[model samples]
Target chain A: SESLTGTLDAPFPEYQTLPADPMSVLHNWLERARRVGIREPRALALATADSQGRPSTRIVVISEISDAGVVFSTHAGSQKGRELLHNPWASGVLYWRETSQQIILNGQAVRLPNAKADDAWLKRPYATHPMSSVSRQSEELQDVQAMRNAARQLAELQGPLPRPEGYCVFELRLESLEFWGNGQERLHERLRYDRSDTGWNVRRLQP
Target chain B: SLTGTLDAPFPEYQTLPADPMSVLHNWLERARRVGIREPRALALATADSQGRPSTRIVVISEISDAGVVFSTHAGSQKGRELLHNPWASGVLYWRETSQQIILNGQAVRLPNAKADDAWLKRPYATHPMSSVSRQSEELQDVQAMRNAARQLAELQGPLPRPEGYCVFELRLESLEFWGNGQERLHERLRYDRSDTGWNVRRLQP
Candidate 1:
C-alpha cells in the first residue's frame, strides 16, 4: 500500500504560537514568504461573481495587508471591479507550495477613495500607466498590433501622465480567515478565525 | 521615471486553437517540468445559493477534452454548494513559473461507479479516512477517528471501500491562459467554446 505522498517533512511548529487575530498571523506569514525568496509571494487568486451568480477568478497582487484589510488595485471598469461594485462579497486564496502554507479569505470588497487611488497610481511604473489609459481590460481585442501602437503613442506623448479615472483600489473587509498547513495522510492543520463583535473566535477545522 | 523591466516573452500563436484543452495541456506540462509541487492542484471557487463565493484548494484527478475531474465527499460544503449552483471556476497557478490557468464552467457529478474508479486509483491507505472523519466538520475527537478506522479494518478486512464520495467534472465553457510579465503587460489568451467550436482571443492584461 502506497502511503500518502508529499507530506510536510517536519510538522509546522508555528501552529502553536498562532495569534487570536488573523491579521497578526497573516502579516507574519507574508514576511516568512518573502524571506524564502518566493517571487510574487503577494500574488493571490481572487474570486468574484456577477449579479446573476456567474463566478470568475484571476490573480491579483496584494498591495497592502493591515487591520484595515487586504488591498489590491485594478481598473474600476474591469469585469472584476464591476462585479464587486454590484456584489461586494468575494473570496481570496494565497497558497505557497514551498512553505506548505495556504490562506483563504472570504469578505466584502469596498473601493478605496479617489485620494487613495491617486496614491496607488503614483507607485506604478510609467510604462504600465498606458494599461489604464489606452486599453480596457477584459474587452475583446480585434487587433493586438493596433492596441500596442495606441499604448506606445500614449507613452511617448505624456509629459506628465495624470492618474486614470478608471484606476481604483479595493480592500477586502474580511469576515472569515483560514490558515492551513500541510500534514501527513491528508490530516492537514486548519486554523479558522471568525470576526466577532469584541474580537475573533478561533477554531480548528478538520482537514 | 521607471520604464518596464520584465522580458519573459511568450510563444506566439496567430489563431486560437479549436480545443482549449490543448493549450491547457501545454501549460500543465511546463508547470510539471518546472518542478512545481502538486502541479495539478487548483483553487476551486464555488458559490452558495445566496451567491457568496468560497474557495479551497483541491487536486485534479484527471484532465481531458471532456473536463477536469476531482473527488470529494458528497456531504462536504463544496459538494452542497455545487448541488445548489452547478456553475464553478477554478484557478491552477504555478508560482515557480509565474503561469496561471483559469477554467470556468458548469459541474456534473459523476455516477457512483465512476467515482469508485477514481477512488480505487488512490493508494489503499487513504480509503479508511473517508469512512472515519466527516469532511468540513469540526474535529471533536481524533482518537475516535483512529478507532473507527481500526474497527472498519477488522470488520471489512482489506479493500474496504466507503460510500458518499463523489467525483465532479467541470465541462468547461471557457479557459484562459495567462503568462506573467513583470513589466505589467502580461499575456492572456482565452479560448471560449460555442455551439460549433471554440474561438480564441487575446485580452488586455
Candidate 2:
C-alpha cells in the first residue's frame, strides 16, 4: 500500500453558511473530487435491504444528480434491483480517498420511466450493446467462454439493439445527506441535512 | 479521472475456484499492490429491527474461510444495529485497481475473551477514546472528548480498554467480485454457499 498513512489530509474548507439545497453541496464535493483527478468520482456504494431486514451492498456509478434526485442504471432483476423493488428505502456512500472526504445519502428509490431507461441505453457505446442481450444477471452460468462467444456473435448480428426489458434506472429522492470531512486527529467533521416538512434541517454531528 | 479508463477483460469465469475466501483474499492483495492506502476499508451496511438501512466505513481485520472479522464498540450505532439484526453486507471498492468486492452474511458476535485479545492488539493510548462518549450519541464539543480521554487515561493507568468493546465475524453467505470494463460491459462473478458446497457463477454486469 501507499505510504500515505499517518493522518488523512483535511479536504473540506470551513463554511460559515451552508446552501439551502443539499444537492448543490453534493455537486460541489463531486466537482472537487473530479478536479482532484480521482478515478470514477461518481462511483458510490449502494446499500439496499430485503423485506426481512437483510442488508446488501454493491458499487454503482451515479449517472445523474439533479433537483429530482440521484440516478443510476442497473438490471432490474439483479439482487439489488430486486431488493429495492420490495423495499424502496436505500442508502449510498461516496468515499474519496484522494480527498479524505465522504458523502452519505439515504432515501427512497423510485424507478424511472422506460423512456429514460431507453435513453440511457441508447447513449452507451456499441461495444456494450451485446452484454444487455446476452448476459442474464444474477443467474448461474454453465460456461463463461460459451456466453462470451454468444455475446460476440449477437453483437455482430445486431443492427440497432433494443434495450433489454431488465435494464432500467432508479432515482433516489434524498431524505437525509451527510458530508464527512476528516480532521487532523480523529475529530472528523460531520455536517448533515435532513428533510423536514417545510424544508431541510441542517446540523453538525460528532465524528 | 486519469485517462486510464477500464479496458482489460476479466479472467475466465469458469476457472473460478470453489473457495470464496481465496477470491476475496486475491482481490484484497491486488488492492494493496495498486497502492490503495486503506485496502481493508469497506462500506459496511446494516439494518435496524424496523428494516431501516444505514452504512458506514469499517476496516476489516481478518478474512478467513470462516468469516470476516472487524471490531467496534458494542454501544456504537453499527454495533447496536447488529445486535438486533444479525444480517449485514459490505462492499469494498478499490478505485485504483478498478475492482469491487461485495460480502453479505450474518454477523456473529465474538465472546469477550476473543474481543479483548483483539482490542489488546490496538494502540494503548487510543483505548481511552472509546470511553469518552457514547458513539452515535449527540456530541456537543471536541474539548469534551479530549477531556474525557485524558481523565480516563489518568484514572485507569495503562492498557485499560473501555467497556463493551466487541468483535464481530460476518459468516459470508454470498460474495461477489466485479471488474470494471471500459465500454460499461463490466465483469461480475458471484459465489454463493449452498447446502452442498459453494457455487460460483458469472453475473451480468
Candidate 3:
C-alpha cells in the first residue's frame, strides 16, 4: 500500500489545457518555456549509447521540431555524434522547469543533409571570449589555457571566423511521446501516445 | 559592449561537513537521497546510436561516487540485467523550483554480497514485492506471481535473512552540481576530483 504512493498523483496541472495530440501541444509548450525565462531554454538533453550500451548525455540546442521531427545539432566527430552514428535510435527530453512540464520523445534518428546542417552551423556566433570554441567534452583537461589555446588556434587558422567539420546534425522521428505536468503536491499529469491503425492512441498513465 | 545581463545572488545552503576527501562529503549527500521522500526518483535518460535521447523517472535506492553502485533487486525489470550490459549512464537531480543539483554517473552493478546486504535492509512489508519479481525476465501467469509471493512470505524471519535477492548501485566518476539563481542568470559550479585539489570552474553560460 505504501510503496505505490508515488502513483497516487494525477498527471495534469491544475487549470491547464492538454492537447488531444501530445505532439502539437508540446510544440506550444516549447514556445511557452522560452517566454517563461528558461535559461538556455532551447537546450535539450540528448541520450545516446553504443552497441555495447555505453550511454552519454549532453545539452544540445534544438534547432527545429515539427511534423518532420525534432532536430538538433552537435559536433559530427564529437562523443555524442559518434555514438549516434553507431546507434540510430535515440531519445530526447525537453524539460520546462518553471511550468513543471517535461516532454519525452523516442524515435528513429537520421542525419540531416549538408545544407540543413550548414544553416544550423552558420548560426553559431564567433567566440568573443577566451574559453569559447572548446570542442572537447567529458574529457579530462590538464590546463584551461591549453584548451582555450586550441579554440584560439582554430579560430585564427580559419581567418576572421571558423567552421568546424566535426559538427553533426540529426532529427528524431518521434514514435512515442509523453507529457508530465507536475501538478500540486506531486500530482503529475501524464499522457502517452502510440501509433494506432487510424491515429495515435493517447493514454493516461499512473503518475 | 553587451551589458544588462547579470547573474543573481545565490542563497547558500548549509554545506556538508568538510571531509578529508572532497567526494566523501558529496557521496554522503548522495546517500542522503535514498532517505528522501521519493527515493525512487531518478532521471533515466538513454541515447541510441543516433544521439536521440529519452529520459524516464525510475525509483532509485542507492548511489555512489566511486566505480560501482546499484539501485534495484533481481525481481524488477532492468534489475540485475541492466548491469549485465553495464553501459548505461544515469543522473540524479535534486531541487524544487530552482537550485538543482545534477549527478551524471557511469552505472554498473555492485558485488553480489553488497547487493544482498542492501536487500536485507529492505522493509519486511515490501520484501515480498522483490520475491515476486523476475527481473527483466517476464512471467506469463498472474497466479504464478501470487504463488511466488506466498511462497516467499513463508521464507521470512524463520531462518537467516534471504541472500539470493540482488541489489544495484552506481559508481559515479563525473558529476555537475548546478545551482540556479534568479532570472536566466544561473551559477554553474563543477568539481572534478581527478585533480589533487578540487578543480572548480564556472562555465560560460
Candidate 2, A85: how far from true, in Å? 1.3
Q: What is candidate 2's lDDT per residue for A1-207, written digit by digit as tens? A: 111243434455533366677788887888767776665767778999998999999888898996856999888888889999999889888877766677888999999999999999988776677877777776666666777777878778656589988898999999998887765345556778889997888776655
Highest-lDDT candidate: 2
What lDDT tens digits, residue by residue, belong to model 3 across residues B50-128? 3344565555554334533444544332443353444455544333323333444455555777766665566664565
Q: For candidate 3, lDDT tens digit of each residue in A1-207?
A: 222333222234312443456667666666666565544446555677666665665555577886846888765665567777787777666654445566777777788888876676666554432222454433444454555556566656543344445555788877887776654322235667766676676665433
Candidate 2 lDDT tens digits, B1-205 = 2233433335634477888888777667666665665777789999977787888878798886777999887887789999999999999877656777899999999898988787777766556666565666656676777676677667543455567778999999998888765344567788889998898877765
Top DockQ hit: 2
Worst 10 residues of 2 chain A by lDDT: A1-10
Q: Which regions in candidate 3 have their CA more than 4 angstroms from the true location?
A: A1-20, A128-143, A150-160, A183-187, A196-198, B1-21, B24-42, B46-54, B58-86, B92-167, B173-205
Worst 10 residues of 1 chain A by lDDT: A1-10
Score residue A183 of candidate 1 by CA lDDT: 56
Restricted to chain B, the TM-score per model reads 0.87, 0.89, 0.62
Off by over 4 Å in 2: A1-9, A13-20, A157-160, B1-12, B150-159, B181-185
**TM-scores of the models, in the order given:** 0.89, 0.88, 0.58
TM-score of chain A of 2: 0.91
Name the candidate, 1 or 3, with the larger lDDT value.
1
lDDT of 3 at B4: 19
Query: What does the i-RMS of model 1 come to?
Result: 4.1
Ranked by DockQ, the better of candidates 1 and 3 is 1
